[PDB]
């Protein structure tokens, strides 16, 4: 076929026609299985081919992925009859490998139909029933492994796979198939409305994962008290608003500064709080001197001071235990050094 | 005799320079000086980080013409385990092992080199959430991460890109949604700038890779999965979609624009690898396409220009070859091609700064590095000359 | 990390035995068994000390950062900074 | 030839044709500052001397014949083949 | 033991053990890989030896070229500071006083720097005596100090220069009565070798310029101040002036022939600087001046030419500005021309031996450093070619 | 100077010469001025130059 474009000038003249109608059998023939070969790969079906795969890894929805993929498939196969039907001219189907030749295309691209698992798809869609409207974000009942109590773990009231389905609606619209309008809408919104509910998502995770690192070290709790209370303040004023309004999206981006500040502050008092115990055991076992004693004094002092000037909250019974504990080591080492 | 000096000193974890110094020279020790037309150089197939594993993005350093970053999304082999897996890759000696690892929380999309600062690493994952990483660091958390936010990118994001240059530096990223947002590498906890890239009638454009005419900033171009290619003024005299083009009719998956710069300016010229193996080229004075590359159907993946010649890119196709295409030579067969071996699912080519050789991505995560002809390699005004005649020929 | 630096370092020769050693000399960690190990390491720390010494009479800002010996039998590979003194056992291919 | 050595050993990086020292702490041959390199002449033969007994220590049987002595401003190529101990003074890359 | 021995045991024919262990650790040994615009240089200005002061003459060291004579000559301050200052700044670091100081009696005004002692400062003062300071000696009197006899010079001179083979070493004085000498470096009691230049019968020449062609010493360009350029015979039998040449109407405040090699001679070729702004890209031998630049209302005081680009060379100026003329990128307009600080009347322009960096002289005694930009400094192979065909336009 | 040196033997044509310093005679004046401001230094400078 590229050998034939090189060269169409004369084709109109009934002289060159002689040659290319003497390996007209072999061109037909040789189209024949092409086709045949690409409907031998179309067989393998989507699922079953890594186009499927690659189409998941490029953000493309199984389902409109093997839609695109038929619609491509039969694209090329339209390109093939059109360019078989330029290079040879008209009525190639007159002979009578030419019309079997367009009766297997036929018969291949019905069986390459597309609007059905388009209907299907929409069908199931509008069976199940997809929302999101309800509370901001809900609390449910779980008993976790490991833990005989029932743990009230906080979750959102959004399922991410509603997304999902409005990039499939965003691609059909442009792919020329319509559906519902109540589909519409419900895809409109929940894609308008996916940055506060995956933000919010995000926060709450990011807040819950740091507020069990600080009750891993039951030690550093009773200074974080104060943030963990205005963090629930702020979910307490939160979780009584419906699942859409007006003040979602302020409420969405103080709580989200609010619980990345929270966990900063998080992990400065924690790797501050294991510099002081570190900077504490040490002095455990510290030899007898007031001048070694003197200097770690300075640096816990230095450190307290340090939390002190960060405006923490809850500090001074924290730095009275903390005394507490030191005077008691103190007195260890007291009666080490004085027998 | 000690017992806890040494257990102690083993538990700190003062070995930053110690574990730098050794990965950087053990694999020079693996040396062996004891006394006593396409062709495959060196293949990498990472086990431990790329076991049945898809590649996600692939990049050159600028900085450093040896060092190669690849991306991986989520492994379904294991949840568990870390799933957005970066590798660092390096050439100064052969080595199975990669130079350096990096791990994020979220499935690693895209993922490139800083041309600012010739040691900071940034990917796009899946969360839409841009990743900062350190090379001279050892660390495998993030560095930095941009806040997920309304005015940020949530969507997935696929390409990223630094744009100016070492002192007037600006990193910008696409979202799959149409955000498109430009940071700088000094810090990246906020947008510098933010605007939801819109077409007509206020709907937005499902960017989903996005190329820049070379030596130039602003005037962006992106490719949208829906089968059209736009032209996006970043600031001009109005941020937008400046152009609509005419397309392809299958989704478009790797756009690029012409990079070797010579005695004519190409730059303008702009080719796109679509879903039906159609890489479109044309230029953005013309709205129509001005070729059309057809040899088989089903997903040529992406078309990268090479860096030295002037009329000659790659491009991967996803049923298992890759084919070199020149146009001063051929118009309608590649002039180079291969398939790599056990036909696997080839995802993505991305050719190396000056050119020579060409880095080609898979599925499976065994990406292979190969040069090519030096006969076909090295461009001449000749080359130049025919390719503006050839363009010239329709 | 440790072990995964050990298994790196081991896995990428097959390497008969390597152990961290971050103190000069005298280390308790064993890859084989304790004597060839120990003893070892702290005659090569005895005389990597030495070469330090001869690197630094020419000059004495210099140090010796890597140090490799391949002889007829065996590899040795020790990449000293200020305490990280490495130990490989290979065959001299 | 000895002279055939000298262009071989001088088109190396960093070195001045090529130098030579015996086991009596001189070198053989003389390619530069005299009294420096008969310094460290002895300082070579003293720790490699004792390099040697180190591996006889536990490889009785093993001959030596290469030693990377790099630093951060050059690499040094000793090797010793029974007397003839042969120096190469080189730049790291 | 001693080094006898060694040469029958070298001889003795027990080295192919040797020799096999020098090739395979040779051969081992070969891979070698990796561990891991014109702008203000820099400030020189003495304040007891520079108050005022005026700059006469630069040099630069051959065995030391971080090293820099300056020569302050004129004093009127005050009767009773010292007449004539010679200055030696260094360039390996920076200091705000030069590294060694020196007096004359006279006005010191002429200075080079000594080839055969690199321990030895010659210059030319007023008086006309040649001036020694050896550098090892803690006093800041002259060393040693020719006669004003009339055998030696016993006019103002001007150039003053050593030349020649380690071995075989002549310094050549002229002053401006037009008497040319030699004198050995070491003995200076004596003319060794002098003559009085002369043209054509009763015609005196007025020297105010000379500079030796690259590796010629037998025969020379001189500088007259009747702005009439010679070349002369520095020994022969035509030992004099050999060329009549139109010059220019203005005296000639400069000379300098060609200071680069490498490809095809450009030696003959010569630039000389007048008095009215007209330096004459020219050959010793043709007769006409090949070309004279002219602009401003100010003129030259130096001309120097680059020590490694064959096009590029350096202009001085009245009005404080200094600029550059590479003839191969344009011949109308100077390539890089910037202008000092106060617009003071610069005297002496000195390149670099290295050709990286160019000093000028000042009207006050602040001496500049300034340095070049790459692509204006370093020549390339094309370079020689495309001046050999500008010089062939015309 | 070099400007119009680019035209040299342009300004011989017949179309070419209306098209030169017909259009560029108030130029003209400015380097006339540009030439006073040139002796200007010659103006006062005899002593002190």
Known sequence: ?339 | LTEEEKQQILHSEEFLSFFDHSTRIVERALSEQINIKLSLNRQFFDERWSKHRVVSCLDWSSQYPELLVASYNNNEDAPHEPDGVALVWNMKYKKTTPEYVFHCQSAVMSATFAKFHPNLVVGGTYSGQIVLWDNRSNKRTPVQRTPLSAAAHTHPVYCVNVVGTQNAHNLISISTDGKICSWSLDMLSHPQDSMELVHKQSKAVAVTSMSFPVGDVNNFVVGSEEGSVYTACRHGSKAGISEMFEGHQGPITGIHCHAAVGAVDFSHLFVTSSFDWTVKLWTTKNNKPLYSFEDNADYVYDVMWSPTHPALFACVDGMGRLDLWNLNNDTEVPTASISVEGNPALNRVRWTHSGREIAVGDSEGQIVIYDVGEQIAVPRNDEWARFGRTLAEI | EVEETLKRLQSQKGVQGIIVVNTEGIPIKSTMDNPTTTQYASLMHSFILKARSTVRDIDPQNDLTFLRIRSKKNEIMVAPDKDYFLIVIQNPT
């Open chain 1, 1 to 339: 076929f590229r050998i034939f474009s090189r060269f169409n000038a004369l084709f109109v003249r009934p002289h060159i026609r002689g040659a290319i109608r003497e390996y007209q059998t072999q061109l037909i023939q040789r189209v024949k299985d092409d086709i045949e070969s690409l409907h031998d790969k179309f067989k393998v079906q989507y699922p079953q081919s890594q186009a499927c795969k690659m189409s998941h890894v490029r953000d493309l929805p199984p389902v409109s992925g093997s839609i695109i993929w038929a619609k491509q498939i039969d694209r090329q196969l339209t390109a093939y009859m059109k360019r078989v039907e330029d290079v040879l001219g008209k009525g190639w189907e007159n002979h009578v490998e030419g019309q079997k030749l367009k009766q297997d295309g036929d018969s291949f691209r019905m069986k390459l139909n597309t609007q059905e698992i388009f209907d299907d798809w929409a069908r199931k869609v509008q069976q199940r029933n997809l929302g999101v409207s309800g509370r901001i974000f809900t609390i449910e009942s779980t008993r976790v492994r490991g833990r005989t109590g029932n743990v009230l773990k906080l979750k959102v009231n959004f399922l991410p796979e509603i997304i999902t389905l409005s990039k499939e609606v965003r691609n059909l619209k442009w792919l020329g198939f319509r559906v519902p309008l109540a589909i519409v809408n419900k895809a409109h919104q929940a894609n308008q409305l996916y940055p506060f509910a995956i933000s919010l998502i995000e926060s709450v995770r990011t807040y819950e994962r740091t507020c069990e690192k600080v009750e891993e070290r039951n030690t550093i709790s009773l200074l974080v008290a104060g943030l963990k209370k205005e963090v629930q303040a702020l979910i307490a004023e939160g979780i009584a608003l419906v699942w859409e309004s007006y003040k979602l999206d302020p409420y969405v981006q103080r709580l989200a500064e609010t619980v990345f500040n929270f966990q900063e502050k998080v992990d400065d008092l924690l790797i501050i709080e294991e510099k002081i115990d570190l900077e504490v055991r040490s002095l455990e076992t510290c030899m007898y001197d007031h001048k070694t004693f003197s200097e770690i004094l300075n640096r816990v002092q230095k450190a307290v001071d340090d939390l002190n000037l960060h405006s923490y909250s809850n500090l001074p019974i924290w730095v009275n235990k903390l005394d507490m504990e030191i005077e008691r080591i103190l007195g260890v080492r007291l009666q080490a050094g004085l027998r």
